[PDB]
Amino acid sequence: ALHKVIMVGSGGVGKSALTLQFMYDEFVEDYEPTKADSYRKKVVLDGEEVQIDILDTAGQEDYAAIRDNYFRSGEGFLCVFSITEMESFAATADFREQILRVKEDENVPFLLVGNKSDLEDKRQVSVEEAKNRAEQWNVNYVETSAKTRANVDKVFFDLMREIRARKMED
Amino acid sequence: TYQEFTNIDQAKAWGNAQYKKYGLSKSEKEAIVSYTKSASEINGKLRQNKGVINGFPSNLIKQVELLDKSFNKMKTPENIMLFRGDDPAYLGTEFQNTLLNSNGTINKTAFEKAKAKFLNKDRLEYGYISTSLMNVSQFAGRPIITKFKVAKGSKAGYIDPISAFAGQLEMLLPRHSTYHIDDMRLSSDGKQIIITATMMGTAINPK
Numbered sequence: 001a002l003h004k005v006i007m008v009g010s011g012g013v014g015k016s017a018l019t020l021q022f023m024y025d026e027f028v029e030d031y032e033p034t035k036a037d038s039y040r041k042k043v044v045l046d047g048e049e050v051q052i053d054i055l056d057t058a059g060q061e062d063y064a065a066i067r068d069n070y071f072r073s074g075e076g077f078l079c080v081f082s083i084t085e086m087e088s089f090a091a092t093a094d095f096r097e098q099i100l101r102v103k104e105d106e107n108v109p110f111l112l113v114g115n116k117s118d119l120e121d122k123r124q125v126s127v128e129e130a131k132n133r134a135e136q137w138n139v140n141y142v143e144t145s146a147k148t149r150a151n152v153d154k155v156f157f158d159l160m161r162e163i164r165a166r167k168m169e170d
Numbered sequence: 171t172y173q174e175f176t177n178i179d180q181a182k183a184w185g186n187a188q189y190k191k192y193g194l195s196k197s198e199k200e201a202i203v204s205y206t207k208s209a210s211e212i213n214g215k216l217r218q219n220k221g222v223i224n225g226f227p228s229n230l231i232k233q234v235e236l237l238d239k240s241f242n243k244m245k246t247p248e249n250i251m252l253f254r255g256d257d258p259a260y261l262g263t264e265f266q267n268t269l270l271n272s273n274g275t276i277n278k279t280a281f282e283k284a285k286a287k288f289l290n291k292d293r294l295e296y297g298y299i300s301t302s303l304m305n306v307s308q309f310a311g312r313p314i315i316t317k318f319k320v321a322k323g324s325k326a327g328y329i330d331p332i333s334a335f336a337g338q339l340e341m342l343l344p345r346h347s348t349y350h351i352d353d354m355r356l357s358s359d360g361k362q363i364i365i366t367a368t369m370m371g372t373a374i375n376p377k
């Protein structure tokens with residue numbers, strides 16, 4: 001099995017850091033903001049060997065044709081905001097809307113990810129408002145830190161589980 | 171050394187001379203006209219997302235693409251000084267209600283903090299940058315004046331002719347541009363911060 005994950009979210013929320021933390025168990029700071037890359041690794045997901053594919057989108061230049069293409073091919077989405085940036089939380093609705101527009105499936109595997117949980121001291125987005133949005137969207141909300149590793153493996157594995165469940169029909 | 175226009179008619183002649191060579195498409199013109207009506211919204215969403223556009227609705231993302239690509243046709247033939255005026259929030263939300271003294275002068279504590287924050291540093295702008303060939307009335311009453319040193323060959327479009335909504339002598343710069351703040355000083359007034367910056371260029375370079 002190959003579970004195709006797309007990272008979405010405003011610039012600077014930690015898409016790259018989260019991807020590189022998951023992939024290589026390292027905290028990579030200030031990864032080139034406008035640089036996109038695709039990753040693939042074998043993981044054991046509930047006893048079964050599977051491959052995860054992660055597209056760490058840059059997004060600054062991902063015009064209609066480009067983003068529509070990878071939204072269509074992507075099977076699951078980590079919709080990342082930073083808990084220290086309300087604007088990034090606000091923007092999550094936009095990524096989701098555009099994802100929903102192309103996939104035409106509200107049951108699309110999707111996790112709302114509040115990143116930079118190590119920066120509680122700078123929090124702008126309440127857990128309440130995020131959880132409420134997640135509930136509204138019928139998705140799980142997880143708070144992560146690419147810095148401390150907090151819930152990083154969890155978001156990827158949980159999303160894979162959702163993609164796998166979605167694939168179970170058919 | 172950068173050309174700095176000292177006369178409106180000269181600035182217009184220069185601008186027209188560039189504009190004539192652009193050969194913008196109907197859709198590029200429409201995108202630019204729209205920009206001159208809707209800059210606040212487009213630039214706001216760009217800033218909100220730190221330049222990321224893949225959450226933009228169909229109309230907006232198509233407009234962004236058209237705008238971005240239009241700069242392939244719009245270059246300055248010459249080192250040029252460009253101007254814009256800004257309100258305190260340009261310096262950060264912490265300056266919004268803080269920059270100004272009660273008498274209308276720039277608070278010197280706030281100014282030193284802004285200098286500390288920005289002087290001798292690169293700044294990345296997520297929105298497109300609307301500027302003028304001169305310090306026009308639109309900008310000249312604002313508390314912050316920025317003079318951009320824009321190098322020969324840089325993406326920069328004279329869009330005054332394209333739209334009635336275009337600012338006086340408006341020069342548009344591409345989004346996601348970096349500039350380096352070289353100098354920050356108070357006007358003789360004490361009522362304005364005058365910022366001098368060197369435009370470095372845009373990350374947005376569609377083939």
Ligand SMILES: Nc1nc2c(ncn2[C@@H]2O[C@H](COP(=O)(O)OP(=O)(O)O)[C@@H](O)[C@H]2O)c(=O)[nH]1
Binds near residue numbers: 012014030031033115
């Ligand atoms: N403190 C902290 N910083 C982070 C975290 N994740 C990313 N960053 C930093 O936030 C900035 C943006 O991260 P990046 O991965 O480039 O975000 P992206 O633009 O969405 O790919 C960089 O300086 C990262 O080092 C985190 O969990 N905690």
Ligand SMILES: [Mg+2]
Binds near residue numbers: 017031032033035058
């Ligand atoms: Mg990144």
